[PDB]
Design a protein around this nucleic acid. Structure first.
Ligand SMILES: Nc1ncnc2c1ncn2[C@@H]1O[C@H](COP(=O)(O)OP(=O)(O)OP(=O)(O)O)[C@@H](O)[C@H]1O
Ligand SMILES: [Ca+2]
Ligand SMILES: [Ca+2]
Ligand SMILES: [Ca+2]
Ligand SMILES: [Ca+2]
Ligand SMILES: [Ca+2]
Ligand SMILES: [Ca+2]
Length: 901
DNA sequence: TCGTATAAGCAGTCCGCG
DNA sequence: GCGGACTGCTTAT
């Protein structure tokens, strides 16, 4: 096989590399790598090395990495650019793996672990590590085994061995329901004392040294706790055995409001799954407890027990250990679905970076661009200091608040990356400037043509047309990968709808799910077999189709994230190729394209309807337009349609055969006007929306910018079995809105869009009457809690104290003295409830940690003093009033003359 | 919240508005 | 009461 790296580190003048050799075996080596850097030189000096602007360079080979580093400093002292890859391990990888890396994940050791620590005096601080580690479960991907290290004897209690037989049994048998599929993969090891547990763990770690290390909060809790505990008991040198090169570093993480410390383990790549999830999941969750995320992702029940966790080990050690094991498995189950480890490995090896660097698009793109240029013997520029400066972004059209019956939407495929490619926007392709006219003169095609030589953006920038820049070239490669995976995702989505249709008529029989690839549209043969299948087999196929769709979504949306973050990196001062001329060239061109094509679509539709000056485009944001189709539907007559799906086909056909060709012609003219390198503005139809045929549903509505709702029948070629609500920005989409309120507001919207005013009125009346029975957690608001200390004046609200912070301070007073009650953590999220006048907490609200029940001693009082009237008005009635006034209807029936009878 | 970008919505505080 | 200046938080893109 071809060799590939696992990890790489610089330690002084040595590179330390773990790698898989040509026989598929893990190896480690120390290499005294001699890096090269570059300086500009005279023309007469013959070289093969040139900077990105074509200026000749001489290569300087250093005796060691420390010499290169000192050379860079002295070059700053002189005032001259020091060119080349200053991160030497990236140069090492580039030299050592000078080909497209083909990696074999089965050879990479991925470890997933979790520890338990009993603590009677509140949260066990990792930096202190003053309590015994009483359980470790460590899963190894190569052995496919869960290794369990169990402490039987502790100052906080002596206990019996955990029983795998009881673990396996059902909850209803008194067991722990550890999944049967992992029961045989558990290797259980009990210990008399913590010292021998820990020494054994280190010996094990030496044998099975993680390459990728993950888990839930491992970077912030598990790793620092284990490191600092071993340090306290045995000393530093022993603690550093967690690094295969015996080197670690205490690493301070800073933000605007304080800082914390992590432990960097040299020769390990730590990918904490909580951070993978936050970056790549495209969710914003009320809570990030493993319990909460597992429930959301997997539909598994909460891991239930009696009493506080601080007494779980001594009261029920059996369950204590079983829940440690299940916690580890939960993360593997989330990854099986979401596939973020797979994503990270793909991106990391593509870029030739340390795998943990996938969190930084700046590092990722610096490595991609360096490797690309190095192939052509070109030399990268030195990074420079820049002050942070604002710059302008996208155009967003102000909609007229209203109901909108029939809507068709279009938007650009990979908008900003396509602009980069079309205009040829790159550091080394800047050709000059031209004198800019007001943006509207370009939009209306009345400004002078910018250039007859170079490719232009309306911000005044001109670019070379004779060859692609390195940014367009590399962004295209990742864009093409994105396109492939989006295709797989959309096929899986279409296949899912075929299964849902067939579930209307499930056959009474015993049979199996078909063995099919859900990434490709089902053949006619597969479709015929599906119509004969039972509900059980269809349901299992639907689940598999939906897992394939999720796998496709992860691959495509995060490749989209990566290329969009290259645009964004151009406006970040730490990026080697930072340049606000290029960032604004992209955003300003985007503004023009949107309003240019708005004009063209309006002109086109006014033409086919024989009107003048009528506005068919009702809204747009960044690179999308929403088109009113009422007049198109009315030109045929609603009476002519057999059913909903009939007019959806008609609009689908109109969009593809009439609108898109008009859109394409409009952008071809704009490309020539700007003299761009290549026409890449491709604005595909997205949504087809309207009410069910013959209903009183309103179809859709807008309240304002970034706030709308549409009843969609077809989305990018997916024809739904049942219409789907596309709701953007409204309170149903906000993590701050209470769960039960999201649900009720969504049903009100469904009724508005599908059934009409009377249906909405019936549902409102009922919700208002019954909502006081809703569980308190379901009706709590949610907020992040920053700067709690800033607003704490003697345990009371200081000036301008935010409502949610006030709630936290109220909580802090109510639990004072207790080292047992849960503390609210700075920067994490809280549930919030209003309180009726004259309550015992002495203020108008209370907040507590999100994803948890409020502690029992104040729970009853909170439940008794909850202000349901305020909660209803603020979270439900206010937003609904906004939706309904925008849609021009009433959520409460108005009086009439018929009331006289 | 260590980790690419800007535009823009709503909740709430503080206080003016005769 | 509303709305402007401001902070805080959370979306759409
Ligand atoms: N997270 C982001 N960071 C930087 N720019 C973004 C981000 N999200 C969107 N944009 C910018 O807005 C443009 C339009 O976004 P949109 O959500 O329509 O996705 P897109 O990149 O056009 O891809 P698609 O083909 O899925 O529409 C992007 O091309 C860019
Ligand atoms: Ca635990
Ligand atoms: Ca787009
Ligand atoms: Ca699209
Ligand atoms: Ca059937
Ligand atoms: Ca869009
Ligand atoms: Ca009480």
């Amino acid at each position: 096989m071809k060799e590939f790296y696992l990890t790489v580190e610089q330690i002084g003048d040595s590179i330390f590399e773990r790698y898989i050799d040509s026989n598929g075996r893990e190896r480690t080596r120390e290499v005294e790598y001699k890096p090269s850097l570059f300086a500009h030189c005279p023309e007469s000096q013959a070289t093969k090395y040139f900077d990105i602007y074509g200026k000749p360079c001489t290569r300087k080979l250093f005796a060691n990495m420390r010499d290169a580093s000192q050379w860079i400093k002295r070059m700053e002292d002189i005032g001259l650019e020091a060119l080349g890859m200053d991160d030497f391990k990236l140069a090492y990888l580039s030299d050592t793996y000078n080909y497209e890396i083909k990696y074999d994940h089965t050879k990479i050791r991925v470890a997933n672990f979790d520890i338990e620590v009993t603590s009677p005096d509140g949260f066990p601080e990792p930096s202190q590590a003053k309590h015994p580690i009483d359980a470790i479960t460590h899963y190894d991907s190569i052995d496919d085994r869960f290794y369990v290290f169990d402490l039987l004897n502790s100052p906080y209690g002596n206990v019996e061995e955990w029983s795998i037989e009881i673990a396996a049994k059902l909850q209803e048998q008194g067991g722990d329901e550890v999944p049967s599929e992992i029961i045989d993969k558990i290797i259980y090891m009990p210990f008399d004392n913590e010292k021998e547990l820990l020494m054994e763990y280190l010996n094990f770690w030496q044998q099975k040294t993680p390459v990728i290390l993950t888990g839930w909060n491992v970077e912030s809790f598990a790793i620092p706790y284990v490191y600092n505990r071993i340090k306290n008991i045995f000393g530093e040198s022993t603690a550093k055995r967690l690094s295969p090169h015996r080197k670690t570093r205490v690493k301070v993480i800073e933000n605007m409001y304080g800082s914390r410390e992590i432990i960097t383990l040299f020769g390990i790549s730590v990918l904490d799954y909580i951070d993978l999830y936050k970056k790549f999941s495209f969710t914003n969750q009320p809570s990030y407890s493993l319990d909460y995320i597992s429930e959301f992702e997997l539909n598994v029940g909460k891991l239930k027990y009696d009493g506080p966790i601080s007494k779980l080990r001594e009261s029920n050690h059996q369950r204590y250990i079983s829940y440690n094991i299940i916690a580890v498995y939960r993360v593997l189950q989330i990854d099986a679905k979401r596939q973020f480890i797979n994503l990270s490995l793909d991106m990391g090896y593509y870029a030739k970076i340390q795998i943990q660097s996938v969190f930084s698009p700046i590092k990722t793109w610096d490595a991609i661009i360096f490797n690309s240029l190095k192939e052509q013997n070109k030399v990268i520029p030195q990074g420079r200091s820049h002050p942070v400066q604002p710059y302008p972004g996208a155009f967003v059209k102000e909609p007229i608040p209203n109901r909108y019956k029939y809507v068709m939407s279009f938007d650009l495929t990979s908008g900003y990356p396509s602009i980069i490619r079309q205009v040829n926007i790159s550091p080394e392709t800047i050709a000059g400037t031209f004198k800019v006219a007001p943006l509207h003169d370009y939009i209306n095609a009345v400004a002078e043509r910018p250039s007859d030589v170079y490719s232009c953006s309306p911000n005044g920038m001109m670019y070379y047309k004779d060859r692609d820049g390195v940014v367009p070239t590399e962004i295209t490669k990742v864009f093409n990968q994105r396109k492939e995976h989006k295709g797989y995702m959309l096929a899986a989505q279409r296949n899912g709808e075929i299964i849902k249709e067939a579930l209307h008529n499930p056959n009474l029989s015993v049979d199996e799910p078909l063995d099919v690839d859900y990434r490709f549209d089902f053949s006619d043969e597969i479709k015929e077999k599906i119509k004969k299948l039972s509900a059980k087999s269809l349901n299992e196929m639907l689940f598999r189709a939906q897992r394939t769709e999720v796998a496709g979504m992860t691959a495509q949306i995060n490749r989209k994230l990566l290329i969009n973050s290259l645009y964004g990196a151009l406006g970040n001062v730490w990026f080697r190729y930072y340049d606000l001329r290029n960032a604004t060239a992209i955003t300003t061109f985007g503004q023009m394209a949107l309003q240019w094509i708005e004009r063209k679509v309006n002109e086109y539709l006014n033409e086919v309807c024989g009107t003048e000056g009528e506005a068919f485009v009702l809204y747009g944001d960044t690179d999308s337009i929403y088109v009113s189709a009422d007049k198109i539907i009315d030109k045929v007559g609603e009476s002519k349609f057999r059913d909903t799906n009939h007019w959806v086909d008609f609009l689908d056909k109109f969009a593809r055969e009439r609108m898109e060709p008009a859109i394409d012609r409009g952008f071809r003219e704009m490309c020539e006007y700007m003299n761009n390198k290549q026409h890449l503005m491709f604005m595909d139809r997205e949504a087809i929306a309207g009410p069910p045929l013959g209903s009183k549903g309103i179809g859709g509505f807008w309240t304002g910018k970034k706030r709308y709702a549409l009843n969609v029948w077809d989305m990018e070629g997916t024809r739904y079995a049942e219409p789907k609500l596309k709701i953007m920005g409204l309170e149903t989409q906000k993590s701050s809105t209470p769960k039960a309120v999201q649900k009720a507001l969504k049903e009100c919207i469904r009724r508005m869009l599908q059934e009409g005013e009377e249906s909405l009125q019936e549902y409102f009346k009922e919700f208002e009457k019954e909502f006081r029975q809703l569980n308190y957690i379901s009706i709590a608001s949610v907020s992040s809690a920053n700067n709690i200390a800033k607003y704490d004046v003697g345990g009371f609200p200081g000036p301008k104290c935010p409502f949610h912070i006030r709630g936290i301070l109220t909580y802090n007073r109510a639990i004072k003295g207790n080292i047992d009650a849960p503390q609210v953590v700075e920067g994490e999220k809280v549930y919030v409830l209003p309180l009726r006048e004259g309550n015992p907490f002495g203020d108008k609200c209370i907040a507590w940690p999100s994803g948890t029940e409020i502690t029992d001693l104040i729970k009853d009082d909170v439940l008794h003093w909850m202000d349901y009237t305020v909660l209803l008005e603020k979270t439900f009635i206010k937003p609904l009033e906004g939706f309904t006034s925008a849609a021009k209807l009433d959520y409460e029936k108005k009086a009439s003359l018929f009331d006289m009878f």
